[PDB]
Amino acid sequence: AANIMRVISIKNYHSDIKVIVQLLQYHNKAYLLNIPSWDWKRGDDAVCVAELKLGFIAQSCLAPGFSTLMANLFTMRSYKPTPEMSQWQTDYMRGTGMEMYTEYLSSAFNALTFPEAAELCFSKLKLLLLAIEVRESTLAINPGPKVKIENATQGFFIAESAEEVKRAFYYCKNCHANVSDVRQIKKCKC
Amino acid sequence: TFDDAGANVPLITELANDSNVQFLDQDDDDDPDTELYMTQPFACGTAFAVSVLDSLMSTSYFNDNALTLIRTLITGGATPELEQILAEGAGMRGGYCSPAVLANRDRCRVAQISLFDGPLAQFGQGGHYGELFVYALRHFGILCIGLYRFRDTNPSSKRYVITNPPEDFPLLPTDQVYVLTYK
Amino acid sequence: RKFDSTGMFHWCPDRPLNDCLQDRSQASASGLRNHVVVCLFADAASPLIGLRNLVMPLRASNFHYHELKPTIIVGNLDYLHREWKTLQNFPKLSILPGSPLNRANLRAVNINLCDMCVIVSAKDRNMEDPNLVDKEAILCSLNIKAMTFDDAGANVPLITELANDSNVQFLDQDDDDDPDTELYMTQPFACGTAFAVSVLDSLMSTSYFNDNALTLIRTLITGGATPELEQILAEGAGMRGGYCSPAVLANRDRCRVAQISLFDGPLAQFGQGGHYGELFVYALRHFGILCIGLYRFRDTNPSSKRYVITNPPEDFPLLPTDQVYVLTYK
Ligand SMILES: [Ca+2]
Ligand SMILES: [Ca+2]
Ligand SMILES: [Ca+2]
């Protein structure tokens, strides 16, 4: 109730402000969906922690570890070894260094299918591409061979840092990005 | 005891207070200065707590689409139209559906598959995660995102999750693979 | 038809609340139009607000039975059970039990076709701090203001009663709020969309300086509740009534405050650039209508918001879209 009154206050002061609010109960989301100037298409958003909580554990009933797989992608953390960690703890902790990032695919991906673009990201760029924003626009997760990469397609990647995913924006094919150690991709198709 | 066992029933518990994760498991080596995500019950997917969801706020600011990606996965496909319909207070309306709306039943989902048997089992005998990834993407359109591996490589049934392994990462025949899939 | 025993109000023999209770299908099947909707917000234990004081003016005997506005209360049923003993003597009343914030109750009630939606609360006046005190009333206003009635929405007429005056700022948008303005200067009060008990404080001093002026306003606002009716209610028998003699029924010609439009009919000549003084004199002479003010659109071009002008100057220019407040006998 207190948080809804704050969004009502912020929107009353100026309707166009992007408000992102944290909510504790799913039935309370209905109240702010009904405010005259709440608009999800413009950015307004409600992080309902009851919805999200029960959603992660429900998907774990179908894939037995997803809630940990997935809840680690949405906190920034950097992998930092310590020599007393067991093998499983080093393997686990390397994985916790991952997050999900958005980046534009370079023009070198144009007219590939999503399967070629994903093989290319994984094998050459060491990036896990998992989705694309298809042009109004719509998200597609793991789309099949029917879907082509269009120019300025935004993709969703799992990677260790935003400095990794830039490689997909700078990847310039036979023109310049020819060489096989990933640290070297850093400049355009000059 | 379920004599026709017991510590092998799969379980996930939601904690009101994260530091209580230490009581949740034995053979564990607890330490109160470790934060939740490093503890064995969370690494095994046996525990969850709302504190790991705090950083969703900043992801809604930096890339709102990423928050819609996770919401479409975790809700199993709840669109803003369904949130709109629920906000009318009539409850969830439904019935028989037209082929044109029923077309949306081919949604991508996160499934889990085993390297123990079937066509991927060739990678379980000392293959590497990169070989598996490329093969499954090409033959099945399966997009592999991680592993679920036994902690005791010899004892207990506890498994831990490895997100996005390196291309050269060695597989075991007992591993399970997380996959984005259409069927 | 039957009236109360002083002939001042329409009357009905008692009933059980279940005669007037309706579900959403019954309410939606009923062709409610030009009605009053009361959106009550109450807990079962919360204090009685005396809805009789709302309904009784709407059943004033000077209206014909066909022109009484139907009334429907949307609210908590356990509360309305203990309210009902006071309401059970009024015709054309109904109850849809449930929350006014459910956007279904609102559609079943035909909220888009009503003549007034009243938003009212019985909740504790410091259930929490002064920012939470009107959150249900504010949400209910904003909810109705957002709906879509495609066969709209922000043109349903509404009046809300505020427990805390400074919350008037949340009640409307396109508004330019300022916390140092006092309630009577704010746009929602100037439009008749908001009310709060703080504007009634100065009645105390008017009772001292001229008690008759307080009886004037009470006869208008109650629709004719005389001290004899207050005496009869104080006997605790409830409101007694039946068929009435022509000698008491004579009091059905009471003066009332009505509102009329300059858009059409005989006064429309003044809407084409006439002045308020020309209108006043004409209507007083031809109809015995006594004009006391205007209700004019704020946006003279957009929104349906109108503001009230009390007693304009003789030379004040009229618009064809104005409405006039009138004291009238018929
Ligand atoms: Ca990282
Ligand atoms: Ca332990
Ligand atoms: Ca305002």
Short mmCIF file of C-alpha atoms in Angstrom, two decimals, chain A residues 18 20-22 26 29-30 33-34 40 43 45 47 49 51-53 55-57 59-60 63-75 77 85 87-89 91-96 98 100-102 114-115 118-119 122-123 126 128-131 133 139 141-144 154 156 158-159, chain B residues 12 14 37-38 40 42-45 47-48 50 52-57 59-61 63-76 80 83 86-87 108 110-112 129-130 133-134 137-138 141-146 148-149 151 160-167 169 178 180-182:
data_model
loop_
_atom_site.label_atom_id
_atom_site.label_comp_id
_atom_site.label_asym_id
_atom_site.label_seq_id
_atom_site.Cartn_x
_atom_site.Cartn_y
_atom_site.Cartn_z
CA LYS A 18 9.50 5.60 -15.80
CA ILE A 20 10.16 0.73 -11.40
CA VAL A 21 8.64 -0.56 -8.16
CA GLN A 22 9.20 -3.58 -5.97
CA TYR A 26 0.85 -10.45 -6.58
CA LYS A 29 -0.05 -5.62 -8.87
CA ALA A 30 -3.66 -5.28 -10.05
CA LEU A 33 -1.99 -1.79 -13.41
CA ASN A 34 -5.22 0.25 -12.99
CA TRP A 40 4.44 -1.10 -19.42
CA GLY A 43 9.02 1.22 -19.19
CA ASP A 45 7.53 -2.00 -14.19
CA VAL A 47 9.21 -6.44 -9.75
CA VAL A 49 8.89 -10.73 -5.56
CA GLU A 51 5.47 -13.87 -8.45
CA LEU A 52 9.18 -14.23 -9.18
CA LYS A 53 9.91 -16.36 -6.05
CA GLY A 55 8.06 -18.79 -10.55
CA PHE A 56 11.73 -19.79 -10.01
CA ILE A 57 10.84 -22.66 -7.65
CA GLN A 59 10.48 -24.10 -12.87
CA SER A 60 12.68 -26.12 -10.60
CA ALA A 63 14.15 -28.76 -14.28
CA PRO A 64 15.53 -29.75 -10.95
CA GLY A 65 18.13 -26.95 -10.51
CA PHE A 66 16.91 -24.05 -12.56
CA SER A 67 16.26 -21.71 -9.72
CA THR A 68 20.02 -21.59 -9.02
CA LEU A 69 20.99 -21.68 -12.71
CA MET A 70 18.72 -18.78 -13.39
CA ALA A 71 18.89 -16.65 -10.21
CA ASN A 72 22.69 -16.40 -10.65
CA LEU A 73 22.32 -14.81 -14.14
CA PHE A 74 20.58 -11.75 -12.65
CA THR A 75 23.18 -10.59 -10.11
CA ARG A 77 29.34 -11.15 -9.72
CA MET A 85 38.03 -24.36 -2.84
CA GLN A 87 36.91 -28.80 -7.66
CA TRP A 88 33.11 -28.60 -7.51
CA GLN A 89 33.32 -25.20 -5.78
CA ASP A 91 33.41 -25.21 -11.23
CA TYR A 92 30.32 -23.82 -9.52
CA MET A 93 31.87 -20.43 -8.77
CA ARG A 94 33.15 -19.98 -12.37
CA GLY A 95 29.52 -20.39 -13.42
CA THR A 96 28.33 -17.76 -10.88
CA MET A 98 28.06 -15.32 -15.64
CA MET A 100 22.79 -12.14 -19.00
CA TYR A 101 23.64 -9.19 -21.29
CA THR A 102 22.00 -7.46 -24.25
CA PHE A 114 19.69 -18.01 -35.43
CA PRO A 115 21.33 -21.52 -35.33
CA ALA A 118 24.55 -19.17 -32.12
CA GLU A 119 27.18 -21.69 -33.38
CA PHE A 122 29.78 -20.00 -29.15
CA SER A 123 32.61 -21.49 -31.24
CA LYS A 126 33.06 -17.75 -26.72
CA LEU A 128 26.33 -18.04 -25.42
CA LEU A 129 23.61 -16.32 -27.49
CA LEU A 130 20.19 -17.37 -26.32
CA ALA A 131 17.69 -15.01 -27.92
CA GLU A 133 14.72 -9.10 -30.40
CA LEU A 139 11.61 -11.26 -28.14
CA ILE A 141 14.10 -17.32 -27.35
CA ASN A 142 16.09 -19.97 -29.24
CA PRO A 143 14.20 -19.41 -32.57
CA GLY A 144 14.57 -22.15 -35.24
CA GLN A 154 19.70 -7.07 -30.57
CA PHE A 156 20.72 -11.76 -25.45
CA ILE A 158 25.26 -15.21 -21.28
CA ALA A 159 28.86 -14.07 -20.63
CA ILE B 12 13.37 -27.27 -2.55
CA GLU B 14 12.09 -21.32 0.55
CA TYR B 37 24.80 -18.08 -3.28
CA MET B 38 28.09 -19.80 -2.22
CA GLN B 40 26.01 -25.95 -0.75
CA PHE B 42 21.84 -23.05 -2.88
CA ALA B 43 24.53 -24.44 -5.23
CA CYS B 44 22.50 -27.69 -5.32
CA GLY B 45 19.15 -25.95 -6.01
CA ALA B 47 17.32 -23.77 -1.11
CA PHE B 48 15.91 -20.47 -2.31
CA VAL B 50 14.04 -13.72 -1.83
CA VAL B 52 18.80 -13.37 -4.55
CA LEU B 53 16.04 -11.43 -6.41
CA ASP B 54 17.15 -7.98 -5.11
CA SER B 55 19.29 -7.21 -8.19
CA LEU B 56 16.30 -7.58 -10.52
CA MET B 57 15.55 -3.88 -9.77
CA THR B 59 18.24 -5.10 -14.43
CA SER B 60 14.80 -3.54 -15.02
CA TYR B 61 16.59 -0.19 -15.28
CA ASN B 63 17.70 -3.64 -19.88
CA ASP B 64 13.94 -4.09 -19.36
CA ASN B 65 13.79 -6.67 -22.18
CA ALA B 66 16.04 -9.02 -20.18
CA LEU B 67 13.47 -8.90 -17.38
CA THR B 68 10.74 -9.83 -19.91
CA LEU B 69 12.93 -12.71 -21.11
CA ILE B 70 13.17 -14.18 -17.62
CA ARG B 71 9.54 -13.53 -16.88
CA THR B 72 8.42 -15.39 -20.02
CA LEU B 73 10.58 -18.36 -18.97
CA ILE B 74 9.69 -18.44 -15.25
CA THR B 75 5.92 -17.85 -15.67
CA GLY B 76 5.68 -20.36 -18.55
CA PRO B 80 0.76 -8.57 -20.38
CA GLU B 83 -2.04 -9.66 -16.55
CA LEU B 86 -6.56 -10.88 -14.37
CA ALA B 87 -6.75 -7.16 -13.43
CA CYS B 108 10.43 -22.47 -25.88
CA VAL B 110 13.88 -24.93 -20.27
CA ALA B 111 14.12 -28.67 -20.08
CA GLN B 112 16.80 -31.00 -18.74
CA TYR B 129 30.89 -29.49 -23.55
CA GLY B 130 31.66 -27.61 -26.79
CA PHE B 133 26.75 -27.87 -27.60
CA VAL B 134 27.40 -27.68 -31.34
CA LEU B 137 22.19 -27.21 -31.66
CA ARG B 138 22.61 -28.52 -35.11
CA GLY B 141 17.91 -26.99 -32.27
CA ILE B 142 18.56 -27.62 -28.55
CA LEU B 143 20.52 -24.75 -26.97
CA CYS B 144 22.55 -26.04 -23.98
CA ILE B 145 22.98 -23.52 -21.12
CA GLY B 146 24.66 -25.55 -18.32
CA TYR B 148 23.84 -30.46 -13.31
CA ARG B 149 26.63 -32.70 -11.97
CA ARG B 151 29.04 -33.43 -6.13
CA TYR B 160 25.39 -28.87 -8.28
CA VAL B 161 24.77 -26.55 -11.26
CA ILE B 162 27.47 -25.31 -13.65
CA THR B 163 26.28 -22.35 -15.76
CA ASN B 164 27.74 -22.06 -19.29
CA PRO B 165 30.92 -24.25 -19.06
CA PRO B 166 34.04 -23.56 -21.22
CA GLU B 167 34.17 -25.14 -24.71
CA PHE B 169 35.05 -28.63 -20.31
CA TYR B 178 20.02 -27.75 -19.15
CA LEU B 180 16.32 -24.41 -24.15
CA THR B 181 14.00 -26.48 -26.39
CA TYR B 182 10.77 -26.35 -28.47
#
